[PDB]
Enzyme design. Sequence first.
Site, mmCIF file in Angstrom:
data_model
loop_
_atom_site.group_PDB
_atom_site.id
_atom_site.type_symbol
_atom_site.label_atom_id
_atom_site.label_comp_id
_atom_site.label_asym_id
_atom_site.label_seq_id
_atom_site.Cartn_x
_atom_site.Cartn_y
_atom_site.Cartn_z
ATOM 1 C CG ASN A 147 -26.534 -40.664 98.984
ATOM 2 O OD1 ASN A 147 -25.956 -41.470 98.224
ATOM 3 N ND2 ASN A 147 -26.808 -39.426 98.641
ATOM 4 N NE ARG A 163 -32.162 -22.077 111.785
ATOM 5 C CZ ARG A 163 -31.045 -21.961 111.061
ATOM 6 N NH1 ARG A 163 -29.929 -21.452 111.580
ATOM 7 N NH2 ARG A 163 -31.044 -22.368 109.794
ATOM 8 C CE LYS A 182 -22.298 -29.708 123.159
ATOM 9 N NZ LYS A 182 -22.527 -30.980 123.892
ATOM 10 C CG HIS A 221 -15.294 -52.510 122.089
ATOM 11 N ND1 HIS A 221 -15.054 -53.845 121.844
ATOM 12 C CD2 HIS A 221 -15.696 -51.978 120.911
ATOM 13 C CE1 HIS A 221 -15.299 -54.107 120.573
ATOM 14 N NE2 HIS A 221 -15.705 -52.995 119.987
ATOM 15 C CB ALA A 274 -22.493 -32.153 106.451
ATOM 16 N N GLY A 324 -24.282 -35.424 105.142
ATOM 17 C CA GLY A 324 -23.288 -36.448 104.965
ATOM 18 C C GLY A 324 -22.262 -36.453 106.086
HETATM 19 C C1 LIG Z 1 -15.624 -41.311 124.008
HETATM 20 C C2 LIG Z 1 -16.446 -42.599 124.163
HETATM 21 C C3 LIG Z 1 -15.551 -43.813 123.844
HETATM 22 C C4 LIG Z 1 -16.921 -42.764 125.597
HETATM 23 O O1 LIG Z 1 -17.586 -41.580 126.068
HETATM 24 P P1 LIG Z 1 -17.763 -41.442 127.633
HETATM 25 O O2 LIG Z 1 -16.474 -41.688 128.320
HETATM 26 O O3 LIG Z 1 -18.945 -42.275 127.955
HETATM 27 O O4 LIG Z 1 -18.150 -39.919 127.900
HETATM 28 P P2 LIG Z 1 -19.576 -39.220 127.810
HETATM 29 O O5 LIG Z 1 -20.315 -39.848 126.691
HETATM 30 O O6 LIG Z 1 -20.165 -39.200 129.168
HETATM 31 O O7 LIG Z 1 -19.215 -37.720 127.391
HETATM 32 C C5 LIG Z 1 -18.028 -37.072 127.882
HETATM 33 C C6 LIG Z 1 -17.896 -35.721 127.226
HETATM 34 O O8 LIG Z 1 -17.099 -35.867 126.024
HETATM 35 C C7 LIG Z 1 -17.908 -35.665 124.888
HETATM 36 N N1 LIG Z 1 -17.640 -36.745 123.952
HETATM 37 C C8 LIG Z 1 -17.750 -38.095 124.159
HETATM 38 N N2 LIG Z 1 -17.423 -38.809 123.116
HETATM 39 C C9 LIG Z 1 -17.076 -37.875 122.156
HETATM 40 C C10 LIG Z 1 -16.650 -38.007 120.830
HETATM 41 N N3 LIG Z 1 -16.493 -39.175 120.212
HETATM 42 N N4 LIG Z 1 -16.403 -36.872 120.146
HETATM 43 C C11 LIG Z 1 -16.561 -35.685 120.753
HETATM 44 N N5 LIG Z 1 -16.957 -35.456 122.012
HETATM 45 C C12 LIG Z 1 -17.206 -36.597 122.658
HETATM 46 C C13 LIG Z 1 -19.361 -35.603 125.348
HETATM 47 O O9 LIG Z 1 -20.133 -34.759 124.515
HETATM 48 C C14 LIG Z 1 -19.201 -35.074 126.773
HETATM 49 O O10 LIG Z 1 -19.074 -33.617 126.769
HETATM 50 P P3 LIG Z 1 -19.497 -32.780 128.078
HETATM 51 O O11 LIG Z 1 -18.361 -32.924 129.080
HETATM 52 O O12 LIG Z 1 -19.665 -31.354 127.580
HETATM 53 O O13 LIG Z 1 -20.801 -33.374 128.583
HETATM 54 C C15 LIG Z 1 -17.707 -42.569 123.209
HETATM 55 O O14 LIG Z 1 -18.363 -41.306 123.205
HETATM 56 C C16 LIG Z 1 -17.381 -42.982 121.781
HETATM 57 O O15 LIG Z 1 -16.852 -42.185 121.000
HETATM 58 N N6 LIG Z 1 -17.674 -44.243 121.472
HETATM 59 C C17 LIG Z 1 -17.340 -44.902 120.220
HETATM 60 C C18 LIG Z 1 -18.546 -45.445 119.543
HETATM 61 C C19 LIG Z 1 -18.182 -46.143 118.257
HETATM 62 O O16 LIG Z 1 -17.493 -45.591 117.412
HETATM 63 N N7 LIG Z 1 -18.616 -47.401 118.111
HETATM 64 C C20 LIG Z 1 -18.396 -48.150 116.881
HETATM 65 C C21 LIG Z 1 -17.083 -48.905 116.907
HETATM 66 S S1 LIG Z 1 -17.083 -50.159 118.193
HETATM 67 C C1 LIG Z 2 -26.521 -26.935 109.067
HETATM 68 C C2 LIG Z 2 -27.063 -26.858 107.632
HETATM 69 C C3 LIG Z 2 -28.129 -27.954 107.434
HETATM 70 C C4 LIG Z 2 -27.750 -25.524 107.389
HETATM 71 O O1 LIG Z 2 -26.902 -24.424 107.758
HETATM 72 P P1 LIG Z 2 -27.606 -23.021 107.954
HETATM 73 O O2 LIG Z 2 -28.788 -23.158 108.837
HETATM 74 O O3 LIG Z 2 -27.764 -22.484 106.583
HETATM 75 O O4 LIG Z 2 -26.554 -22.104 108.722
HETATM 76 P P2 LIG Z 2 -25.341 -21.263 108.129
HETATM 77 O O5 LIG Z 2 -24.766 -22.036 107.004
HETATM 78 O O6 LIG Z 2 -25.805 -19.874 107.913
HETATM 79 O O7 LIG Z 2 -24.283 -21.264 109.327
HETATM 80 C C5 LIG Z 2 -24.709 -21.208 110.701
HETATM 81 C C6 LIG Z 2 -23.504 -21.344 111.598
HETATM 82 O O8 LIG Z 2 -23.314 -22.748 111.905
HETATM 83 C C7 LIG Z 2 -22.143 -23.219 111.278
HETATM 84 N N1 LIG Z 2 -22.465 -24.472 110.616
HETATM 85 C C8 LIG Z 2 -23.426 -24.711 109.670
HETATM 86 N N2 LIG Z 2 -23.473 -25.956 109.279
HETATM 87 C C9 LIG Z 2 -22.479 -26.583 110.011
HETATM 88 C C10 LIG Z 2 -22.029 -27.907 110.037
HETATM 89 N N3 LIG Z 2 -22.534 -28.880 109.284
HETATM 90 N N4 LIG Z 2 -21.008 -28.194 110.871
HETATM 91 C C11 LIG Z 2 -20.483 -27.222 111.634
HETATM 92 N N5 LIG Z 2 -20.847 -25.934 111.684
HETATM 93 C C12 LIG Z 2 -21.849 -25.680 110.839
HETATM 94 C C13 LIG Z 2 -21.651 -22.135 110.323
HETATM 95 O O9 LIG Z 2 -20.242 -22.159 110.195
HETATM 96 C C14 LIG Z 2 -22.180 -20.873 111.004
HETATM 97 O O10 LIG Z 2 -21.270 -20.441 112.065
HETATM 98 P P3 LIG Z 2 -21.245 -18.893 112.506
HETATM 99 O O11 LIG Z 2 -22.461 -18.666 113.392
HETATM 100 O O12 LIG Z 2 -19.932 -18.733 113.257
HETATM 101 O O13 LIG Z 2 -21.288 -18.067 111.232
HETATM 102 C C15 LIG Z 2 -25.888 -27.025 106.587
HETATM 103 O O14 LIG Z 2 -24.725 -26.287 106.945
HETATM 104 C C16 LIG Z 2 -25.518 -28.480 106.339
HETATM 105 O O15 LIG Z 2 -24.806 -29.094 107.139
HETATM 106 N N6 LIG Z 2 -26.039 -29.021 105.239
HETATM 107 C C17 LIG Z 2 -25.935 -30.420 104.859
HETATM 108 C C18 LIG Z 2 -25.325 -30.583 103.515
HETATM 109 C C19 LIG Z 2 -25.242 -32.038 103.125
HETATM 110 O O16 LIG Z 2 -24.735 -32.862 103.871
HETATM 111 N N7 LIG Z 2 -25.786 -32.378 101.950
HETATM 112 C C20 LIG Z 2 -25.698 -33.736 101.430
HETATM 113 C C21 LIG Z 2 -26.857 -34.594 101.894
HETATM 114 S S1 LIG Z 2 -28.416 -33.976 101.253
HETATM 115 CL CL LIG Z 3 -28.385 -37.617 100.702
#
Ligand SMILES: CC(C)(COP(=O)(O)OP(=O)(O)OC[C@H]1O[C@@H](n2cnc3c(N)ncnc32)[C@H](O)[C@@H]1OP(=O)(O)O)[C@@H](O)C(=O)NCCC(=O)NCCS
Ligand SMILES: CC(C)(COP(=O)(O)OP(=O)(O)OC[C@H]1O[C@@H](n2cnc3c(N)ncnc32)[C@H](O)[C@@H]1OP(=O)(O)O)[C@@H](O)C(=O)NCCC(=O)NCCS
Ligand SMILES: [Cl-]
Lengths: 190, 190, 190
Positions: free
Chosen positions: C84, C182, C179, C114, C159, C141
């Site tokens: 999309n 299920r 993460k 980088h 999403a 999305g």
């Molecule tokens: C943060 C980043 C720069 C480097 O990550 P890193 O230093 O290698 O760290 P790791 O991947 O080993 O993960 C470190 C922890 O932070 C979390 N983490 C890393 N990047 C994250 C992000 N962007 N958002 C959220 N959590 C992130 C990991 O899940 C991990 O959690 P844990 O401690 O529970 O295992 C990388 O993850 C990132 O975001 N890269 C950018 C990629 C991108 O946008 N490229 C296109 C433009 S050039």
């Molecule tokens: C994850 C998904 C696929 C299905 O959700 P689900 O299995 O029905 O689960 P529920 O909505 O009952 O929620 C489950 C739990 O996860 C959380 N959760 C669900 N989707 C989430 C998401 N995308 N991001 C973060 N948390 C999310 C809810 O808040 C809920 O938390 P709780 O345990 O504290 O209540 C849906 O939420 C989703 O992201 N759909 C995509 C929609 C989209 O992008 N459409 C356009 C392209 S077709």
């Molecule tokens: Cl779509």
Amino acid sequence: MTEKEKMLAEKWYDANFDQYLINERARAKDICFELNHTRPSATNKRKELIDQLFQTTTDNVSISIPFDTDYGWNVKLGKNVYVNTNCYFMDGGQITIGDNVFIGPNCGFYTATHPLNFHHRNEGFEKAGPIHIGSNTWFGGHVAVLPGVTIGEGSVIGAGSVVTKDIPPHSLAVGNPCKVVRKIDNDLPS
Amino acid sequence: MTEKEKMLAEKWYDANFDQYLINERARAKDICFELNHTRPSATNKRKELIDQLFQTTTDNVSISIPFDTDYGWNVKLGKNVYVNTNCYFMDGGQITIGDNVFIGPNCGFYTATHPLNFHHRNEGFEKAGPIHIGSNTWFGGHVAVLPGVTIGEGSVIGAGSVVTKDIPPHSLAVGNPCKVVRKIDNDLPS
Amino acid sequence: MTEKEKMLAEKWYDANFDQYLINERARAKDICFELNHTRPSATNKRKELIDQLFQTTTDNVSISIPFDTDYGWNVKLGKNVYVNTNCYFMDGGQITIGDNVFIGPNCGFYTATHPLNFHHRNEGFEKAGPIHIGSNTWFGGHVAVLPGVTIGEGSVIGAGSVVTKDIPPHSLAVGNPCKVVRKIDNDLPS
Ligand SMILES: CC(C)(COP(=O)(O)OP(=O)(O)OC[C@H]1O[C@@H](n2cnc3c(N)ncnc32)[C@H](O)[C@@H]1OP(=O)(O)O)[C@@H](O)C(=O)NCCC(=O)NCCS
Ligand SMILES: CC(C)(COP(=O)(O)OP(=O)(O)OC[C@H]1O[C@@H](n2cnc3c(N)ncnc32)[C@H](O)[C@@H]1OP(=O)(O)O)[C@@H](O)C(=O)NCCC(=O)NCCS
Ligand SMILES: [Cl-]
Ligand SMILES: CC(C)(COP(=O)(O)OP(=O)(O)OC[C@H]1O[C@@H](n2cnc3c(N)ncnc32)[C@H](O)[C@@H]1OP(=O)(O)O)[C@@H](O)C(=O)NCCC(=O)NCCS
Ligand SMILES: [Cl-]
Ligand SMILES: [Cl-]
């Protein structure tokens, strides 16, 4: 029931292979393409295209390009709706937007779900969950609102939020997943 | 004070109905439209349009289309600034970017706030919070930086981050909300 | 080794100043520009441009504009891949996509890293981490998939997710960071 009727009834429907729905999406995509390639200062032409897309006479609905929608006619709009760049109103499920609504850039309002089971998903079936956006609301940029969600009147959604659950009225809510942080006092200012 | 002056002073200002600001936004939007419909290999024309948009002679500022900004002249740029696709520098509040800055795709730098109270919001008032982006920084894709935020020199912001608070220099920060995870050693390599 | 060869071997490479890679990126950007300015109902022309971009004969690969990629030839596609609007396949590291893949709007598949140290980063060096997207997957999305990540066959990514780590097969995963919540039962429906 036709597949359109199923879509509008929150039933599984054949989004991918139903000719009527395919053609309706094509109509919308071609209008969005025209709109997205119309100079922002060509006010009249943009209004004409917006009104054709939504099949309504809009009242101060400001759409910053680019914009995307699936059907157009399934977005119900109030007055004074401000939509910044790169939004997508994915409207197989009706998207209802109230009056005095500020929508930030890069917001996605997603009514589409697919089956989790890949066998059913691969068949093209979808189920649409309507989105209701209250009047007097503000969305920061980079927000995604998920299927079936209602945002209450008077509420504010912080940038980057992923709105998975309904947001009560007169509330500030932020996060992934989006959660209420506090109430908003919307009483008439002095 | 004019509304422009209020905007630049971190005061509430009439963003929506002030003619001067409306016209300045129109100038920027029309240039962005031209830029967004200029072939990426038309190097000279793109440079001309970028320099017109930012009202400056840029030095290796690479802008991948599409791009958006509100005023253009309120983005202050160093040299060697690389901006990938679909970014938005929402610059009612000044956005200052240092030298040697890598900005990933789909990043939003948002200086605009609206009132939380819908009565004041509906009147069109905004307050702009400047964003400062240090030299020697890297932003992953899908980052949103919020009003008033400073990212320190030498820092890296992970993809998908929502930067709600200032990030110290020489730090790696990730998340929604974005939080420092560790320091970065930026010492001169051997 | 040439810089292309380094890129494809997960070694640091000179992304910014290597002429061959610069020219390959220019090829891709100009095709994407053409595609992004081709009417959505010009089916034949869009197919031609897609196939030129990916240097392959696609089988029901549906690309909604706008679209972006870096090389094009480094995206390996199965059949029945639905992409999309506003996606970016940043493919210095190979992006392999299976059959029957639904990719939501505003998804970024990012293989580029980088250096954290600004001295090495400022020199233009990058390291590419391939992304593998299993068959029979669905992305909502606003998802960002980070370098080196594999999403297992049969999995669904919610999403707004930021996919920092590999997702096992037949799993539903959501969040920032993404993460598993299920397992998904993908058994043949009755
Ligand atoms: C943060 C980043 C720069 C480097 O990550 P890193 O230093 O290698 O760290 P790791 O991947 O080993 O993960 C470190 C922890 O932070 C979390 N983490 C890393 N990047 C994250 C992000 N962007 N958002 C959220 N959590 C992130 C990991 O899940 C991990 O959690 P844990 O401690 O529970 O295992 C990388 O993850 C990132 O975001 N890269 C950018 C990629 C991108 O946008 N490229 C296109 C433009 S050039
Ligand atoms: C994850 C998904 C696929 C299905 O959700 P689900 O299995 O029905 O689960 P529920 O909505 O009952 O929620 C489950 C739990 O996860 C959380 N959760 C669900 N989707 C989430 C998401 N995308 N991001 C973060 N948390 C999310 C809810 O808040 C809920 O938390 P709780 O345990 O504290 O209540 C849906 O939420 C989703 O992201 N759909 C995509 C929609 C989209 O992008 N459409 C356009 C392209 S077709
Ligand atoms: Cl779509
Ligand atoms: C939520 C918002 C509307 C107002 O924030 P606020 O009420 O001033 O609250 P603060 O900034 O003091 O922060 C409150 C807390 O919520 C967090 N927070 C605030 N906004 C957040 C957001 N968008 N996402 C995640 N967390 C957020 C802060 O980190 C802080 O956490 P703490 O309690 O641990 O310190 C603002 O942060 C925002 O998102 N603005 C939108 C900007 C924008 O998109 N502009 C462009 C379109 S006009
Ligand atoms: Cl906005
Ligand atoms: Cl980038």
